[PDB]
Design a protein around this ligand. Structure first.
Ligand code: FDA
Ligand code: FDA
Ligand code: FDA
Ligand code: 2H5
Ligand code: 2H5
Lengths: 576, 576, 90, 90
């Protein structure tokens, strides 16, 4: 550990790794700190799903996700337990217990919101869905010139897609994916278009996908090394970053105060450039702990010195979910091109098709897989092969259906995994709504209660706004019920429902971007630079100031790439 | 990867690592294969609970455990789902769904049995309890000389304790630990002895324990390296070992057939010495897949050619569980030595004690922590510090209470973790019974059904034996109810219960040890060598042939140490 | 038609359930494997508790039930009495 | 006739129930028959069902009915957690 770096980065998730990839590549001396540890294997910050065992047992990965989602704000618990033995110590009040937050109104919370403290952040467990936002969801980078704004977004997203290895082809040979894609495409008849969910992933084999992560963006190995002898990078895991120190005039950051969790030692680290990519909640926390915005319960009679919009205009998506059981019509359709004679299990049984017949409903590869399944497993009553990949289908957000959709199988199951209905028949439906940014929707930090790292306790005051946000959310529910019925009826135990507020982990706007601090009610400009500060930048989904329904990480990455451009234009790397 | 090694070890759990430690240290050129992957941090095969984040969020570790416990044998599901939509594809029979095993009688199962496929095996998530077995639970290593038998077992257990870093004083300054320990010691004075559970762990700080694992035994780094420049070791993750090839004469193993799960390629690996440490299930599976014992549903009319006792005489322990809420009397005792004045929350509040006072019921370390908690958290109604470690209390197996006991807090929680009762009040109770070995209790492998790695599907035919097993199990239940009541009443939702058969993961005797193949109905001798084979050794809990209540891993490690002494005397390392 | 039931209407479901006796209940195949080893333990899913071994659980009307009281089901019914239109009517 | 535990969190004045009932085509294969060996609680031949909702119109309408309830009920409010849209037991 040095006292002095060119750039310090707080957080080793995919957005801090975007900064590292750009800046380490441009020759800067970079340090990165993460409060969590290396725990994805020898590929530092890699996807935890990239094991042969997890892909053979994919119902198990929900445990990995649950293991590393720590609830942001849990209200004091008021459950009545009145069947204790009379000898047991009993409470007279619902006192502050088990790490609960007495600041939190249980009825204005994002109960689902949770944070991940591990090298690579949330990208060690995410779904890897990376759609672009269309104009209606996206903030402006160029005003008054939409073609310039489109060009800039297309350049940035293209780069970001290269970093993550985004594609739309990894599931193209799944029978279930095509069964569901084709039926939806037919049913909508041009009113809505369907495609594969754009996924940050490369298929290795028919049974294994190498899911991308932070690791894919930047390998997180210390440099210089044999592969990069002229580069300078150090990662320090198990280091809590607590405060950025402001100069008197609030024009520059002078140091970063850190706490090494293994030694207990504390240090002041000096850099030319300070980059905060700790997540939408923890970036906000670190800034408040550093005298930006307002510590404590909001009090408009004491306006803050700096960043009055920090922690206001927060957005989280509404999320509706169900599962379906494939229709009889659709399952019979899988075998529409087959000629089936005799009785399964007898030596006179056969299944055949005519290769390349003009009038076949399915391609030869599909029919081949169906034939081999039905002849090799004559005990099985379904035509879908056993290790057929899941569907990964979307119709992207449009003005006539202003929600994002993911249709298939998600690793983040929400109840006990049922075993009565064959898994091959099950399709999940998740529809995600956009939320209007409103000043009253807040993330704030207590002036008294502290978290497990002795930092100001996060507190939400949030409700989905009346008007458009709420009308759309219910319309989205109805749309999921109507669409999903084209594929099958609901699975008992996975009926149509709204998920807990913030379960979807798409929080935005907590340190939002805009062109003018006052006019746009914002905290960073379009270089992701904190207003007034020469050398302080923020990255992440807390930057996004709009109402969006699509998954935000790709958009955050794109903003980070643009922020890097500004760094490269305004700071000189030290000589190697 | 070379084609030839001195010693090949299958499995990188703590027992394969014992073989690695002894034989790598003695100069052998060693290869180790594991079907699973390096997934745990830069300390290969280390304990997954050794992160700052898990020790601050210890309630989350149950997810890690669940995430890597893959059920062994799941019977065909017969749940009735009669609320599907009429359009949904609906079954006419309870057909083979979801990787279920149609061989399995659901009523003669070990439904809680599960396997872990990751580098370091189950020692990446275990509790680290390492007691010794007393004579009554322990197989003989010396016939007709009890004292020499005891001496041999003491020699081996002492080494094994050293390898795991076993100790009994890591919790000695826990208030909760001593509160429970002292009360049980008094209640059973002159009748039973209580102590700390012997734990494979080293305390690093008052809030952090470094739990041992396979990595403690052997670091799993490839050698030669700077620290061991004359040692030879390679670890090959993601390699499924499928068969040991017998010579025609059934006197020698000639090769190990492997499948590289990343490339998909197959190889035949030659060694002088073949060591199988794949766990009590998968050692059995690999041997039956290699022509030992009998494949398929047991058929006494076709005796097998080799190892007729393989997969018979299996034992698993009965487990009873509850949680209690601490009694009012015990809680009020924690602050018995304090003098309290003033108003909590005000500058007048004072809590003090007299160090050394002969009228003190507690030691000075205890009172100092109570006082500091009461002074720093004056709103809190309990006298126990928030980060006070859990109890780790036992009364070891004796003839008059023939069960192992663990009293405290286990990371393997069985239901949703309640949040309404303060966690400092909760004490877990787990009592483990011993099971008589009976030839009819079996683990066998299907000749048609295969598992996720295309290997013969394991099937159990198990019931707890009538007679002493069953009587003691129920008596154990009653003893838990009587003893736990001395501490507090039961916690609602964690009432006294038997756990699912095999949930405890203490399966033994599946390739059991004895002196004589026929007379002792066994598979390996006291060197752990497979009868009839010069160069094939088995390690693990499947060697243990007795009825035992205590946790078995220390005992298996003891036997592996003895095995390596034979290896070293009967095989020479190749030149470096 | 009691003052007490119309003041506590959430309780009437108990009346209904109390006099709905299931017509055909298939043999139960739920697995209970956490009995004490001393308890009497089934070797098969035998005919228990008035269950119907004729009944395929997958081709049943499991909700069908009957009421044996004077007045029949009209002692608990919802009292909805629409006419059928031609398309529904013999 | 409520079907699960009655919730007490949401004010009852806000709650509206929705029950839609479909029509089933008569099919000779759908049967109520009586065992020649098994008897009921009054020593009478035990009723047994062999029933499925017929394919074709009955099934199509059943699912379009579910969709119709989701569409209609949305005009009044969103679903109450614990009483989400579902088919009831046959
Ligand atoms: C958990 C989850 C998340 C997402 C998906 C699914 C699931 C269950 N699916 C997914 C998402 N996003 C998409 O666009 N597509 C999808 O398919 N998920 C969200 C995505 O995972 C995040 O948006 C993304 O990682 C955010 O990236 P980031 O801004 O780099 O933030 P992270 O939270 O990943 O990493 C922050 C990093 O900071 C460290 N930290 C926090 N506080 C400190 C302090 N004070 N000091 C030092 N370091 C700190 C963390 O430990 C963390 O690693
Ligand atoms: C999961 C668990 C287990 C234990 C405790 C708690 C819980 C929740 N606590 C514990 C236990 N034991 C104790 O004595 N004290 C306690 O406090 N647990 C049991 C303990 O964890 C095991 O007894 C021990 O690891 C057994 O060691 P081992 O014989 O080395 O076996 P493992 O299962 O750990 O590792 C085997 C290793 O082999 C690999 N493998 C499996 N099949 C194959 C094939 N075919 N090819 C190659 N490699 C294979 C597995 O991947 C595994 O890593
Ligand atoms: C239980 C129920 C039923 C209805 C509604 C709600 C609920 C929870 N709501 C309802 C109904 N029908 C409607 O048109 N509108 C609604 O809002 N329900 C059904 C209605 O309740 C029935 O269709 C009606 O009673 C049928 O009338 P029934 O043909 O007279 O038949 P019951 O079952 O009422 O009475 C028969 C009667 O005979 C006795 N019995 C049975 N077996 C024997 C033998 N062997 N010997 C002598 N007596 C026998 C019974 O004890 C019973 O009282
Ligand atoms: O709750 C599950 C969802 O979580 C969001 O964070 C992901 O972006 C979605 F792809 C989906 O997996
Ligand atoms: O089910 C939990 C139990 O698991 C066994 O494998 C352990 O040996 C016990 F210490 C205990 O943790």
């Amino acid at each position: 550990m040095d006292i002095k770096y060119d750039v310090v980065i707080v957080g080793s998730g995919p957005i801090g790794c975007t900064y590292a990839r750009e800046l380490v590549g441009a020759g800067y001396k970079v340090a990165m700190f993460d409060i969590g540890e290396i725990d994805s294997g020898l590929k530092i910050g890699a996807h935890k799903k990239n094991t042969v065992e997890y892909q053979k047992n994919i119902d198990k990965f929900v445990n990995v996700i649950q293991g590393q989602l720590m609830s942001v704000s849990v209200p004091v618990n008021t459950l009545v337990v009145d069947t204790l033995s009379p000898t047991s110590w009993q409470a007279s009040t619902f006192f502050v217990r088990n790490g609960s937050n007495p600041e939190q109104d249980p009825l204005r919370n994002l109960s689902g919101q949770a944070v991940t403290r591990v090298v690579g952040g949330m990208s060690t467990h995410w779904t890897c869905a990376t759609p672009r936002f269309d104009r209606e969801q996206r903030p402006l980078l160029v005003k008054d010139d939409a073609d310039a704004d489109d060009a800039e977004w297309d350049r940035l997203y293209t780069k970001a897609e290269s970093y993550f290895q985004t594609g739309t082809d990894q599931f193209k040979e799944s029978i279930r994916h095509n069964l569901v894609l084709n039926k939806l495409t037919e049913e909508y008849k041009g009113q809505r278009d369907f495609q594969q969910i754009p996924l940050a992933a490369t298929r290795r084999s028919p049974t294994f996908v190498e899911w991308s992560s932070a690791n894919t963006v930047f390998d997180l190995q210390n440099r210089p090394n044999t592969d990069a002898p002229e580069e300078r990078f150090n990662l320090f895991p198990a280091v809590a970053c607590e405060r950025v120190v402001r100069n008197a005039l609030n024009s520059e950051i002078e140091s970063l105060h850190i706490h090494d969790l293994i030694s207990g030692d504390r240090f002041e680290i000096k850099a030319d450039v300070y980059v905060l990519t700790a997540g939408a909640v923890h970036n906000t926390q670190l800034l408040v702990n550093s005298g930006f915005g307002q510590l404590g319960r909001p009090n408009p009679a004491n306006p803050p010195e700096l960043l009055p919009s920090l922690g206001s205009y927060i957005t989280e998506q509404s999320l509706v979910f169900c599962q379906t059981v494939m229709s009889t019509e659709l399952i019979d359709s899988v075998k529409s091109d087959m000629t089936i004679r005799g009785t399964p299990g007898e030596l006179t049984y056969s299944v055949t098709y005519t290769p390349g017949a003009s009038t076949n409903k399915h391609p030869d590869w599909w029919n081949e897989k169906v034939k081999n399944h039905m002849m090799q497993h004559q005990e099985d009553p379904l035509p879908i092969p056993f290790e057929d990949p899941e569907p990964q289908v979307t119709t992207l957000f449009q003005p006539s259906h202003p929600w994002h959709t993911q249709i298939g199988r998600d690793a983040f199951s929400y109840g006990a995994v049922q075993q009565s209905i064959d898994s091959r028949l099950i399709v999940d439906w998740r529809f995600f709504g956009r939320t209007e940014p409103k000043e009253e929707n807040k993330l704030w930090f207590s002036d008294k209660i502290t978290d497990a790292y002795n930092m100001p306790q996060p507190t939400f005051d949030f409700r989905f706004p009346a008007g458009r946000t709420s009308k759309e959310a219910e319309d989205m529910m109805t749309d999921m019920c109507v669409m999903s019925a084209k594929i099958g009826g609901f699975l008992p135990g996975s009926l149509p429902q709204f998920m807990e507020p913030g379960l979807c982990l798409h929080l935005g706007g907590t340190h939002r971007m805009g062109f003018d601090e006052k006019e746009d009610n914002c905290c960073v400009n379009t270089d992701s630079r904190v207003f007034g500060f020469k050398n302080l930048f923020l990255g992440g989904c807390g930057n996004i100031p709009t109402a969006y329904g699509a998954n935000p990480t790709l958009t955050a990455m794109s903003l980070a790439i643009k922020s890097c451009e500004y760094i490269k234009q305004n700071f000189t790397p030290s000589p190697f």
